């Protein structure tokens, strides 16, 4: 929900690490236009955690939304950015008609259509180099047989869907050998007392009868044991009650 976005070749970095992500108000509410991705489903992210998550904020044309795919090549997927074959995360797009544009075309943000070579995935390429495919040079100026790929956008809300301003948030999921830090939301149920019931806690599994406890407890502990090495107290995962 950013007010200012970055360019499509000037991708910024916002770290998502050591936190809990709540997708019950973002993905389940869904204020965006389209919701589709490959690799994983959006109903699989609630019980799956990863090590390091990255994201960005950039607005493309509407015809360039088909180039954002793993293994895709084209005018944007081979010259502006690249998605790798092992891309785990998902891509969410939403139209941004009147707030991200201006009158007579949004000439604030630019995009590169030609590059001198094929780029790697995660390349923040903001250079002003010239693609060459001829014989003679031009001494570094936009002149004879020398392309100038830097040209601004033309966003305005009275236009069609072919270059409608679509705010695309490419959220990149990545699992490593480090343990996971960012995990999705998960609903909870009510608690019952004075009954032999099953326990599915955050860090304790078993069965028994939950009664009131008059024992001392710590705010960081999960469970307690007696002298006979069995569980006799559990702290609430949502709250704190032993």
């Amino acid at each position: 929900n950013a007010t200012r976005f970055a360019s499509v070749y000037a991708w910024n970095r916002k770290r998502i690490s050591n936190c809990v992500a709540d997708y019950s108000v973002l993905y389940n509410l869904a204020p965006f236009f389209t919701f589709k991705c490959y690799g994983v489903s959006p109903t699989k992210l609630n019980d799956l955690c990863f090590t390091n998550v990255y994201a960005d904020s950039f607005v493309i044309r509407g015809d360039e939304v088909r180039q954002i795919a793993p293994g895709q090549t084209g005018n944007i997927a081979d010259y502006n950015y690249k998605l790798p074959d092992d891309f785990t995360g998902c891509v969410i797009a939403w139209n941004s008609n009147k707030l991200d544009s201006k009158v007579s075309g949004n000439y604030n943000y630019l995009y590169r259509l030609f590059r001198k070579s094929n780029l790697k995935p995660f390349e923040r390429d903001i250079s002003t180099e010239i693609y060459q495919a001829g014989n003679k040079p031009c001494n570094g100026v936009a002149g004879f047989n020398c392309y100038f790929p830097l040209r601004s956008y033309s966003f305005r809300p009275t236009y069609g869907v072919g270059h409608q301003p679509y705010r695309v948030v490419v959220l990149s999921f990545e699992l490593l050998h480090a343990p996971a830090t960012v995990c999705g939301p998960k609903k909870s149920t009510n608690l019952v007392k004075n009954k032999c019931v099953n326990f599915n806690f955050n860090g304790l599994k078993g069965t028994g009868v939950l009664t009131e406890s008059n024992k001392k407890f710590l705010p960081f502990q999960q469970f307690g044991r007696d002298i006979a090495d069995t569980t006799d107290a559990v702290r609430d995962p949502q709250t704190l009650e032993i």
């Binding site: 044309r61 509407g62 015809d63 084209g74 005018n75 007579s104 075309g105 000439y107 495919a133 014989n135 002149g143 004879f144 047989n145 100038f148 040209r151 601004s152 033309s154 009275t158 236009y159 069609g160 869907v161 072919g162 270059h163 409608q164």
Partner: protein, 581 residues
């Protein structure tokens, strides 16, 4: 950089066509000079291109449209002179005042005046002043204007390595660089002459059918043997013969096929016109509707406080923006041009990933011939019964299909010798084959032999007769209309060959079939990256221009035109004249 400077210019023309104010005429100019500066700051940097070493065909098709220097090869006073005479010759056609020489106290204007007098007038002498005074008051000063114009464009063509200016309109059809699919610039001359020989019995049976039914209206004005007087063709020149349908109706007791009476009682609007007709495109296999087409286009004339020109055109603005502009009315003919003008805009929807030099048709007539195949497939009884607009049990016999065939005979087949008569004349005035005293004498001599029309008043060299049209007075191409029909019948045959319909081609229907979608969409997405001689082989299988589906379209008509003209005279002669008294 051409996706921004032309896009600022062409949106000002869309803003001028929507809102006509005094601040909007200059809005096209100040955003329009930067595209004309970019058209010359790129073309002077594209003159030293080595075309002897580039092997890429996708690059070299882009550089052929950039190597053309344009109209600024010559000197500074002549580049001022071409900017001077071009806006002069279009202002006098738009603001031309013509009236009767007997009573000049009332003189009206162009568009409400001349249009009504060719529709329902039956008088001989009163309609004769409507055709003669337009050629005697507007076209008198064109002969000092066109004589220096015909020497201006010949010097533009010799420095750009052409033969003459007749090869400039044929330069868009030139295909070079591919072995086996070569097409010379002079190959279009003998191709037009070869395609006319199959339609020469087709027009001669149409020439005898019009004159035999017009014997009852004009007993002592039209000969049974000779040619046609020029002031009774139902049009200003003879391009559209649709207004002569009330005089050449085959059976008046048979009802016409129309949904004008069926559209009023269901309370249809202009929003329901483009919504039901968009279901024709998704059922074939084309992609869906864009949202900028709906909430931003002008289908309803916005009140009487502001003027807006709503002539039907599809505005290919740029970068994937698609807009249409017409005043949609509740009739039969406005629904067919709603099918036609969005057939151009779905052709432009296919090559959205192609660049600016490849975002065009394969020639100058490819963009309009691919739009009429949905308009021909919308007036069929198979489509109109499936949408529920007609009767659920409507009678269809052999006699009511002739009345549908004459709706496609008058406006399509009738302009094709008139397209041949003008474009052979325009090719030979720039080549210098005729002198100044034979400049206008050759025009009605070639008119009397190939279309069968004789002027009732003799015109000297001080009048300019073919420049009263819209395309001659604005310096546009006229060879696009001859291959407009030949491409729209080769497409409409070959698309519903895969739709497994057994019957005639006028009863064929490409909807409710996805076999014609994938056979079309790989041809629509090519654009100028592939030439037309290889894109034709993917659909119809023929790289050459042939007249085979045009003979099979009117094959019930060519049987009936043979049997009705057993007593009539086939052909014409160069002896009869209306002024020979």
């Amino acid at each position: 950089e051409a996706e921004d400077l032309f896009y600022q210019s062409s949106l000002a023309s869309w803003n001028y066509n929507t809102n006509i104010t005094e601040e909007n005429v200059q809005n096209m100019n100040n955003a329009g000079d930067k595209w004309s500066a970019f058209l010359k700051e790129q073309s002077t940097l594209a003159q030293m291109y080595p075309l002897q070493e580039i092997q890429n065909l996708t690059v070299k098709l882009q550089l052929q449209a950039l190597q053309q220097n344009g109209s600024s090869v010559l000197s500074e006073d002549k580049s001022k002179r071409l900017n001077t005479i071009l806006n002069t010759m279009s202002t006098i056609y738009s603001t031309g005042k013509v009236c009767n020489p007997d009573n000049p106290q009332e003189c009206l204007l162009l568009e409400p005046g001349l249009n009504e007098i060719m529709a329902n007038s039956l008088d001989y002498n009163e309609r004769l002043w409507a055709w003669e005074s337009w050629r005697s008051e507007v076209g008198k000063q064109l002969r000092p204007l066109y004589e220096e114009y015909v020497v201006l464009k010949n010097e533009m063509a010799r420095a750009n390595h052409y033969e003459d200016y007749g090869d400039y309109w044929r330069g868009d059809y030139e295909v070079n660089g591919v072995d086996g699919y070569d097409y010379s610039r002079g190959q279009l001359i003998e191709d037009v002459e070869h395609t006319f020989e199959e339609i020469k019995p087709l027009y001669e049976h149409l020439h005898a059918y019009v004159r035999a039914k017009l014997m009852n209206a004009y007993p002592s004005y039209i000969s049974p043997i000779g040619c046609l007087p020029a002031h009774l063709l139902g049009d200003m020149w003879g391009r559209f013969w649709t207004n002569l349908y009330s005089l050449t109706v085959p059976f008046g007791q048979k009802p016409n096929i129309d949904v004008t009476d069926a559209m009023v009682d269901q309370a249809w609007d202009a929003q329901r016109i483009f919504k039901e007709a968009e279901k024709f495109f998704v059922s074939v296999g084309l992609p869906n509707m864009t949202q900028g087409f709906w909430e931003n286009s002008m289908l309803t004339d916005p009140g009487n406080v502001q003027k807006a020109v709503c002539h039907p055109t599809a505005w290919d603005l740029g970068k994937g923006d698609f807009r249409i502009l017409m005043c949609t009315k509740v009739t039969m003919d406005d629904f067919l041009t709603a099918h036609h003008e969005m057939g151009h805009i779905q052709y432009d929807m296919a090559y959205a990933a192609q660049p600016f030099l490849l975002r065009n048709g394969a020639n100058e007539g490819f963009h309009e011939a691919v739009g009429e195949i949905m308009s021909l497939s919308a007036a069929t009884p198979k489509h109109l019964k499936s949408i529920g607009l007609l009767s659920p049990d409507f009678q269809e016999d052999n006699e009511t299909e002739i009345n549908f065939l004459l709706k496609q005979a008058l406006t399509i087949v009738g302009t094709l010798p008139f397209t041949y008569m003008l474009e052979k004349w325009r090719w030979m005035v720039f080549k210098g084959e005729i002198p100044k005293d034979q400049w206008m004498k050759k025009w009605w001599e070639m008119k009397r032999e190939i279309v069968g029309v004789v002027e009732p008043v003799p015109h000297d060299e001080t009048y300019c007769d073919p420049a009263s049209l819209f395309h001659v007075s604005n310096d546009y191409s006229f060879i696009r209309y001859y291959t407009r029909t030949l491409y729209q019948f080769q497409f409409q045959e070959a698309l519903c060959q895969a739709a497994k319909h057994e019957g005639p081609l006028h009863k064929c229907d490409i909807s409710n079939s996805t076999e014609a979608g994938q056979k079309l969409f790989n041809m629509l997405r090519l654009g100028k990256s592939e030439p037309w001689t290889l894109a034709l082989e993917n659909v119809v299988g023929a790289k050459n221009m042939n007249v085979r589906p045009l003979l099979n379209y009117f094959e019930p008509l060519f049987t009936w035109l043979k049997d009705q003209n057993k007593n009539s005279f086939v052909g014409w002669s160069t002896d009869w004249s209306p002024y020979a008294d």
